[PDB]
Symmetry: C3
Subunit: 114 residues, 3 copies
């Protein structure tokens, strides 16, 4: 799986250990090994959410399966929880787009997962 | 809805007021309240279009519904118009990818929009 | 087509001509004219792959058609080869998400391709 956070929070506000925490918790949440989890955090962005520029996050989570109604609500509770606790971003200023990828449309190691 | 613009245009060429203007213009174009509109602008990017490093933009619009043939032609006119006028980007050097998101696959405030 | 690479490799290790090589190679691989091909490289990112911060890349390729099982395998071989060769990223630390876009959902030059 792959998780990306884009935020206007400054780099210095991203605490040490954040990428590893995301890796571990997404491994636990998706049931997939931490070796297959990729994470990417992009601070200092020029962004607005609802017309204002208080801390906000625009995120995506791509996974081959493990995407669905109940699971996505659980992921959202998890990820908003981490973004509030670690980056001080209110959960109501976070969007997370979820993508159920087909294995044939994910490239890795010179091939795909098909 | 969520609008993201990635561009090689420099940061100082992004007019003050651009995020607010995109917000308001999108709220009106999509029929959704400005409070649900998120906008993100990423200047100074290493990018090319058609092999050329002349000014260009790669963008995305995600919305839960309000995405389709007619609407997307109208959004494309609106957004290219804005990019030409405010960032001096020629419409023919702009890609905008539209995504009609299912509400179950958009996380917000510890849950999803489902 | 549109190809984006996000990577933790520094700006300096991206070699001159990289964007142009990506454009020409994608022209051929996709059988699409190079004048329509957009490429974007984002270095110096804060990312991890399998919990490790060794060189990695998260990428996407979008296209109206020409996306499928065998084609995506051949794109991944090509693209992973380029990232290994030019940025010294191990193919097994690369993900490439492929998106087959509907012509109605791609905006260009004040309209769409529907
Ligand atoms: O004949 C074609 C010409 C251009 C694209 C194409 C589709 N795209 C979708 C997003 C970004 C770039 C992009 N290029 C697809 C085609 O089949």
């Amino acid at each position: 799986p792959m998780f990306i956070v884009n935020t206007n929070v400054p780099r210095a506000s991203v605490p040490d250990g954040f990428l590893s925490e995301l890796t571990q918790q997404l491994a636990q949440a998706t049931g997939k090994p931490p070796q297959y989890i990729a994470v990417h955090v992009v601070p200092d962005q020029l962004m607005a959410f609802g017309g204002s520029s208080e801390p906000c996050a625009l995120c995506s989570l791509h996974s081959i399966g493990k995407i669905g109604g109940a699971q996505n609500r659980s992921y959202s509770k998890l990820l908003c929880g981490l973004l509030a606790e670690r980056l001080r971003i209110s959960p109501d200023r976070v969007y997370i787009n979820y993508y159920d990828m087909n294995a044939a449309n994910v490239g890795w190691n010179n091939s795909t997962f098909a």
